[PDB]
Symmetry: D3
Subunit: 236 residues, 6 copies
């Protein structure tokens, strides 16, 4: 009935995307979903893992220890990456690989690094959306370097979450809502309107078909504003 | 058009569930989805992690090195659990926690161990379905021991996968189909017909809404046969 | 004076060996020493470690968390293999390497995986005895593939334990006796009647020469029944 | 003779300090030494390690994978912190502990997290200088919370490097100079003008006493501008 | 027929035992079996692990990287202890625990550290023999401190190896012989003449009963000279 | 005013250097700074890391668990090297690399291993000083083997500490003084009189310029006696 941020159940948080955020990566973006801020960089490396087939792209995720309300243990010192981290990491990699025609990438490898400097819900969705813009900038770099084999960009990709808060589907969850909601959904989509990733979990009352479809439709709606924001950013 | 096992697109593999499979655990089940065979045990431990609120249940997943066509590196010797393992593990724990009213469990902790002795697709879905039966047997043990605080069983839980093979939604994927399919879906549901977990990924052509709903409906259909098989098993 | 299982001090537990237990490995056996049940697989891999000399065989050991009376911590999640595991592992590898003329194996590597699904004493001895049968089946596979350089099978190998229970040497210890006994002995032998491995430890009263020789003679006696069981199994 | 940035041998890079940079920590600062940008947060935690004596402060250091010209392996995934990291970490902790009268801190623990978002030389020196400002802000937070036992701030602390470039002592090294110089020096000082930390290494020609003293004097000179910048920042 | 060191098949290497070797431990011994030199220390710590029953003793083993002909990787930097190390470690602990009546030890814990400064065969046997002397010295320390509950020394313990070199049982193997021999035996015994540990492995021709007994008798013979050397050392 | 050992504020502890200490390494030295005793070995290995440029030298540091007053946890079993260890290790490597003209070393790699058998302050300084002598012996070995490309020895290198004890600069700190002193300094120098390494830390009152220079001058003075001791040792 009333979202903490006073936002409308179908309203995205204020979103900002800053390209060329840090100077070393071939692509670097500061993406902001409200108070969730993540630095997304793409590093172009010559060669490929165990292939011979097309190029490759892999991704990692990290969080600064006090990017969260309560300090979270630095994984570097704990000597291990938790399940959440790997989960988010794998999601990012799949999502961005889906936006590419790896064959046209050449025998190069792209390293996507998404690091959360401030968390407030939806870091994975902000990561995906922001990393895609960094990816485009990177491909332009490799193109100018004549390291590509055509334009490997199959299509743009954005992501967003939805959750049942106070019994109502709400779009783009902040930290408070995410903690409260027992049913949520993270979705990754393309321009065409296809789903590349759909993940929904119910901790309390299991969500029924109608709910899922409603959450899916809400996600699809906000998704369009994201593709818009990305194009805007890419237009300088 | 033609499933390798000659199975019908809406037909489950032959399924078997053997209770009291190994003698130490309070609940032990050998669950078989065709050639996928997994040993699911539940270990009842007194006490709880960092609580004071209700009981607790946590789960782990493992695979014998040659449970797979090509030997997979033993995690114990690699000194680390891969992303797949943690992913499957977390899924199992959430799924089985959703079947319980933790408050009625008492201040006890349940350890779910799902180990694959032979893999051929759907180990996570077989795990969930089989572990639930082991769970019931375990609760009976604790009940007789007067360690419970009521009947913590909220509802049965089963799981199953679906994938687009040769362009058609097929139910309960074996290894061949899983490798071939670029779009799949794993689903966890309750008796009532609610969804507790829905995960779909598209590697190639992104799946559109209609596809998803069709896969979801197929999953829901086979799901009923599973709840049936579990009740049968539990009836000795 | 009275063995818990009411077995005679010179009587082996009921033993069963099932070949082709799981379908992927070139050799797979379910070996059962009473309630001790272990899955032993042999995986044939092309190539060799750091050699140029003959083939190679190496072995690993694992236990399902509730294969034991009290749940034992999964090594994969503990991120380390305990001393017991490595000890048993090394023993298995040496034992099975001793049964082979590595030169005739070719430039192939055999991976022996012994995983305990249910423990009740003597898992290492059951492992050795069962893995040998899996080994034979595997060599037949490689032979048909024309990957061998003759018949690398030098001789069969079996293993068994003995322990001083209630002051009397008893053959093939179950869990209860093993815990009670302060003096035990694990032995690995060949058809010819030679010793390839003899390990005895005394926690309480140190065992004197006569005791050792008596335990050794008991071990040697039961050993013959094992070689018999293996040949039977191999005869379909 | 000519510094890459065209800076004068005794001129600091443009320096900026932004307080309240991220919203969760009791103290958060974005410190910038030219292109070197580091996020420094201080997290106030109740209690103390193994004490009974005074409070405590400990520090960690991290670098985003593409904060450097060439992507540096994420320590979280490498499962270990390199020597450089620990070295810098220990330095930070000592430096900031020296600025405090731990007894007046109370039985609280301060966690200093310095994460490099963009590196270009002097990250450790920027870290120290920036973290001190975050520290002040944090102490104000704890004061208002009535968790202190007086004002634990003994004195401000800043740091800076010096190196022999093209045969001349230069102040505050950027990445290029640092790589070129074979002799450098990192120094940590207080307002009073005391040294809390002096570290100099010579890879090529060993530096003689006169050189050291000259580098020390240069460091001391720029140091004053830093204390000035910190006070300015703290004045809103 | 001819031992490299020209030693007689039943002759021990020159043995030396130096007590109070290093000044911190309650017991410290430099034990030398020919060119094999090991520093054995015993550290007395108040309290016990997970007990309430008696005291405790545990042991560790280490080797300097160039204590061996070819540099062996430092385990500290490899981040793991190999199988050999754990094996030897466990052996040492069992052996020295067998020499004690833990109940009379008090609620104290003894840490045995055996570090090889120079290896040339038989480090484990030299370790055991030397650590026992360090143990005695330590117990005297605790006695004077009135931390004991009687005299926990049940009996002295020494160890030695035997191996088939050039077809002949030889006592106390140096590095050359150990590498050459395919059949060896490590034995741990007490004053009374009992066996606490017997381990024999055959890499080539399996050793028959007569061989084993012959090796055992040789081991038992040299063993007496060791108990003699220990008493001598303990007599200042 | 009064050093525990009754030593004069400008007097080194009794120092001894024994070459050819252990028989396997190309260079092996037992270096003793009073009660601080460290075994320093140099291992000559053919080849080089990731080079093509000159040779290479790298170093490791270790401490026996009871080389210290209170037993320190063995890093091998803790599965990690602490900050102190890496710090000391890096220092050693830099120091000894500075004594060499790597180009003349050939395409060989030198492994320096410094292991403390007994600690009482200044292990790092004793390590450096002793390892240099082991280094010389090693180069002679490689020379005779005709594996060098000239004489890679640029100059001798020694190290020593200084600390403010009871308000007075004292040379070569033992354990007691090191613990007491809040301001100390470790220095590494060459024959010529150059500084290759200068590290000073102040825990309490920050040290002022005059203090530093005084500590530096004291260090430089004792340094000369060390170069003398090394030459003496090298003269048989």
């Amino acid at each position: 009935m009333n979202r903490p941020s006073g936002r409308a159940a179908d309203q995205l948080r204020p979103i900002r995307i800053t390209r060329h955020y840090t100077k070393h990566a071939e692509g670097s973006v500061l993406v902001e979903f409200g108070d969730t801020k993540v630095i997304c960089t793409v590093s172009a490396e010559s060669g490929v893992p165990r292939f011979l087939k097309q190029g490759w792209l892999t991704a990692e995720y990290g969080m600064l220890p006090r990017s969260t309300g309560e300090r979270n243990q630095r994984e570097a010192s704990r000597g291990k990456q938790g399940g959440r981290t790997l989960e988010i990491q794998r999601l990012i990699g799949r999502s961005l690989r889906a936006a590419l025609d790896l064959s046209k990438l050449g025998e190069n490898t792209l390293y996507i690094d998404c690091d959360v400097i401030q968390a407030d819900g939806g870091t994975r969705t902000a990561s995906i959306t922001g990393a895609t813009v960094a990816l485009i900038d990177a491909l332009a770099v490799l193109k100018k370097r004549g390291a590509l084999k055509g334009n490997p960009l199959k299509q743009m990709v954005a992501a967003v979450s939805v959750g049942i808060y106070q019994g109502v589907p709400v779009l783009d969850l902040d930290y408070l809502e995410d903690s409260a909601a027992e049913t949520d959904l993270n979705v990754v989509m393309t321009d065409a309107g296809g789903f590349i990733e759909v993940q929904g979990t119910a901790e309390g009352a299991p969500f029924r078909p109608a709910e899922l479809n409603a959450m899916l439709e809400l996600a699809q709606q906000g998704m369009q504003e994201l593709f818009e924001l990305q194009r805007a950013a890419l237009a300088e």
